[PDB]
Symmetry: D2
Subunit: 369 residues, 4 copies
């Protein structure tokens, strides 16, 4: 009826019968073989956590938020959270790689829910219409204001998805700045005018959350080496799937880290990809800057001199505060930046990197600056 | 010879023989009877830590920083850290009330070191000249470059004094928002051009340190009730020291928290002081705002209707980053804001408060809206 | 209506209107001036926490346990927990000192509840009969099986009193072994046959709790120096109160740490007490042993040779597991030691100490072993 | 020259050039593909940590212990710590299945060090003789007293190997019951009479270490489902290595977790193995008891009615304290139980389990009661 799972992020996650049935299905079990952070373990060696544990964590936090917000459709929203990652391919930024292969561009999460045993499991407790609702909610495609609130609980600025992965990524990578008082923040959330908002008692908790998110992006998600390994990985994965066909969902489901890593370790047609990823031959950071003009002028000089195939450019950006968070004050709604100098200080992260083939690095360095 | 003291911040603090002799003296033991945060325990109940434990913590953090920086004169700077608080008067913001009531203005820390057994104790290990250098170092008044480096270790922006109190204040108040473990920050410190600077590998640790400091200010030091209690206390302390004579250092040494409180709890002349501070009859916050114009305008309308005696004003304007921290880059020494857009962007804290006698509070409220 | 208090042990403690009224009374405020651990700060310098914060913590944990156990009289039990320490005198083991003074030997907690403004505050919400019930519950003097369950929630083996002070004492003294997963233990508690019992899912949590309790006793409560300072303190306090009269409860209420410490610091008739406690002249540990026979034979030799006034003996004992804890298993109640080798291993702590005047220590050492 | 690796257990692990050259070799990188705890992640989902991170942690803890103990041959013992796992075969309890399938029985750790690039790498820094000493030290087979001391640092009861895995296993499994920070224990270690011993000031830290180890055994290593999964895995692994030839070391090196799992997930011969391990069809626990007689009697009645193939038995009998740890007292060297009644009293863990095919489980249950 209820089973407990140890999770070092929370203590224990209690899961009821519907979640357990889903957990034991083949598509959910597959997530144990998909690292949350892809190749990041090559930089942060303890980053071994998988999408399976993250999905359990999302279910847990979704439950907590639904409890705090007194949401009526609690069980349906918890399952939406649990199943949020079913269609995630192995690695980072590789949904954009898979989608253009299949003719429909149908989201893989929607497909795994509707085309596998997951669909049958859900029907035990829900109508097909409620299942369509859970698909909209989990994919962030609400059709009305009711679904919008429920979807925000998982995918919003305070969503259970983000709350779990920020803390889980911090815990495994070893980044103490990524922790925030999730418990206190959840307790200060309110529904107001069909929005999830923060009570003014939660203003420090909100600051801490936004700042923790800043640290995770600068330290881990935008780490210069994590990014170039991902660049090499995606170029490889583009080749591997180039003639693969996803009309059969089982060709998606057979995609896990090990499958891709094995093709890389064994086929000699991919030796170059293999070296760039696994033998420390990734292109080397020539420039990392917050100054777009400096980046652009260096990029231009390099491309005048070096062939394009020997360089890579990466422009990364993330709003730390997107201007759309309300704080419920004594005098009604206000925007968080009106009340917080810290939130008021927050600007988008903008980082520009140039990487070069290890053979040309010295030449590119001296003949360019 | 070497004794260990339990300290929940650090595990144990190990102290050598010179430090123990100093710890055992009466002017150091006095610090056990002066709360680090004065009356803050009336708002944050667990803020019971004293200047005694803080001083042991400063000694321990000074040791650590000297170890990281490979400082020659380690023992002397450790002792300068240890004795840094000898001249502190009970509660907060009290130095400025005692100095005018003393003819020459001499710093009480220097007086306690020179006019009590502390001097004889230090003379066992240090020359007359090194004791004068210890005094300058501890007061932040160096006369040369060696003294300036050593003084920076204790009193600088991330000096051992601040590193200990920010962490200890958070630990005892219960402030779960900052990350307060500066082991990483300490490890990335360097001496360059005779300054304590941060290596670029410590940029994130420096960001975390400045954010943790912002949280302590907004949550604790500038808490609106903490501030009004201190306003009441300081008014009283001035009456109590109308014209006390500090020519005899023992009249300073007898000032501890219990002495001040007893003088209050007992005398019928000081009854309204007692009520405002200890019977929860402090002036009530009418306005707390970040807008100087709203403050100025409310102050005007208010002083039209009510007498000055029945109101108190408080202006807090505090820099979260002072523009004077160096980071050692591969390109040489930079200002921290030159390398961290986030630090470059941290805004100052600006808060304006108006407090009114609790009897007139409802009267003042509706008469202003 | 609800006020939040920061407590580093829990985050925030939320207190309703009845608790707030009680908190702001003179007898509850007095507890801010009574250190939980008495003179232990002379050994563990950060042990500055007071009975005021402990009482708030007891209220908080009582609420949590009542919630987990679905107790009907939740509010009355929470207040019983909040008011549990009202009659605690300053220091350790000094209730046994005060009781024989007053003619009635009435418990001081009962007296403070019934003879001060506390009584009037409680009547706002409860009948005098319910107030008598709260007195029985808080003092562990239940009159029937209903009251017995409620009283166990506060004063039992898993009581909220113990759960708070073990963790609070660990947090402030700096003893990491004294922490246990209080949250998990509370969640596995059950009421069965009018007893608080532990579900079998909580068996590890129970082991951890009992072991944490072991560490606190060996490291802190029975620390050899903590004990001899308490021995000197109690002998002093016996003198101070010898002719004091407690028929007026205000003579109890004026007893706080500062009052006693001041009599000690200022009256020269007590110079010897003062030195033994505050000038490092406490009797020195000559023998500390688990072997009663070795203790007894050494005690006899010393008393043949030295006058009794120059030695002190201390026999300390504590059951770590008292054989009276039930675990609700699949096949009904069992005793914890049937299921746990760790609990099965636990024997009473038995420690025997001899202390001697610092003048006779060397003579006692050589002329005795 | 010196590189830093994030490790959530320690902050960062700093490695010098000899260690980096070893870390970058293929036999060391293999360890990234072998989970520390085998199949435990099927019960404790976050148990994803690998032998790679564990080996870096052993290197780091070895460094720390050499620093505390002032060990001359620090670099050599650190490298012995680093390479300790080179010969580990994927999953748990697998050494004993590989050794009989290899003619001479030579330890695979020694083979990997001598028969791969590891040897050439070590020869850059160490003589032929020091490499033979490193091998003995790491295998716990010393030939003299220096080698024995160094080997104790890694493989002893509180060796760096155990200190790291107990803490790392707790951190990733989520075991909140022990205290697993052994900084204090390390600081109290001494070398006496050429043994690693504990100073009496570390008696409590030693008690905590042994209790923390008890918790890991009862909660994780002896978890009834963890044990049955390993029983199924080991039966399969034996079939897979019926007669594989390990004369070529590359046939050992190609054994990682994914290789074993692939061999299973794919071949139709191994289908019931696959189901028992990966499709939650493991034999179900019929009996778990501490009573050998109940075990023996249930085993008998059971084997009367059901065939051997449909049942599995497991006997676990593990010493929580082995009687062979020394504590340096003021009276000289003692056994730990001579000084700690609690350690003297810790009982062994004894657990007997009977598991049955999940089809026959209800049939076996009521036929036995
Ligand atoms: N060399 C090496 N570094 C690793 C490994 N795993 C994690 N790391 C860390 O991640 C970083 C990888 O960057 P690297 O490829 O060496 O390029 P770098 O930025 O010039 O040092 C290193 O600095 C290490 O701190 C590993 O297996 N080998
Ligand atoms: N009333 C009261 N509040 C306390 C006490 N100790 C700490 N606090 C905390 O102090 C804060 C504000 O106190 P209060 O005097 O009631 O000011 P106000 O509520 O802002 O008008 C609240 O967070 C209380 O939780 C106490 O003894 N009495
Ligand atoms: N000397 C000294 N020790 C203190 C003080 N506060 C805490 N301690 C600690 O508590 C212990 C007190 O014991 P002490 O009176 O010195 O007798 P000891 O057991 O022989 O060291 C010391 O070992 C210190 O670790 C203090 O003010 N002075
Ligand atoms: N059913 C199931 N349990 C899991 C899984 N991963 C971890 N667990 C935990 O594994 C434990 C026991 O698993 P199970 O196979 O159901 O054995 P049983 O419940 O004791 O018969 C429970 O604590 C689960 O919470 C999973 O994928 N499926
Ligand atoms: Br569920
Ligand atoms: Br209440
Ligand atoms: Cl939680
Ligand atoms: Cl990736
Ligand atoms: Cl995010
Ligand atoms: Cl010293
Ligand atoms: Cl103050
Ligand atoms: Cl809590
Ligand atoms: Cl005491
Ligand atoms: Cl107790
Ligand atoms: Cl090295
Ligand atoms: Cl295994
Ligand atoms: Zn997600
Ligand atoms: Zn200070
Ligand atoms: Zn209590
Ligand atoms: Zn190992």
């Amino acid at each position: 009826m209820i089973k407990e799972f140890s999770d070092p992020l929370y203590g224990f996650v209690r899961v009821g019968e519907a979640g357990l049935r889903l957990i034991d299905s083949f598509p959910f079990q597959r997530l144990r073989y998909v690292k949350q952070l892809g190749l990041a373990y090559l930089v942060f060696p303890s980053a071994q956590h998988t999408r399976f544990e993250h999905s359990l964590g999302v279910y847990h936090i979704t439950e907590r938020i639904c409890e705090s917000l007194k949401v009526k459709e609690k069980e349906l929203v918890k399952l939406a959270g649990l199943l949020h990652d079913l269609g995630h391919p192995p690695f980072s930024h590789t949904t954009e790689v898979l989608l253009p292969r299949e003719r429909s561009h149908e989201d893989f999460t929607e497909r795994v829910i509707k085309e596998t045993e997951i669909y049958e499991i859900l029907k035990q407790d829900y109508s097909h219409e409620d299942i369509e609702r859970l698909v909209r909610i989990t994919l962030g495609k609400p059709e009305d204001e009711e679904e919008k609130l429920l979807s925000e609980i998982i995918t919003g600025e305070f969503g259970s998805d983000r709350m779990d992965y920020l803390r889980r990524d911090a815990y495994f990578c070893g980044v103490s700045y990524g922790f925030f008082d999730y418990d206190r923040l959840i307790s200060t959330l309110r529904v107001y005018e069909n929005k999830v908002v923060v009570d003014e008692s939660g203003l420090r908790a909100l600051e801490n959350f936004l700042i923790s998110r800043y640290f995770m992006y600068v330290q881990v998600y935008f780490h210069k080496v994590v990014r170039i390994l991902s660049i090499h990985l995606v170029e490889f994965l583009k080749k591997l799937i180039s003639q693969e066909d996803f009309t059969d969902i089982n060709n998606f489901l057979r995609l896990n880290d090990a499958f891709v890593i094995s093709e890389l370790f064994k086929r000699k047609a991919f030796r170059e990809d293999f070296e760039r990823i696994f033998q420390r031959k990734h292109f080397k950071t020539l420039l990392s800057t917050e100054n777009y003009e400096k980046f652009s002028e260096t990029k231009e000089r390099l491309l005048e001199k070096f062939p394009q195939e020997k360089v890579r450019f990466d422009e990364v950006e993330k709003e730390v505060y997107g201007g759309n968070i309300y704080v419920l004050s004594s005098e009604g709604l206000k925007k968080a930046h009106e009340l917080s100098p810290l939130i008021a200080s927050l600007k988008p992260i903008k980082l520009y990197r140039i990487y070069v083939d290890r053979q040309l690095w010295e030449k590119a360095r001296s003949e360019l600056k």
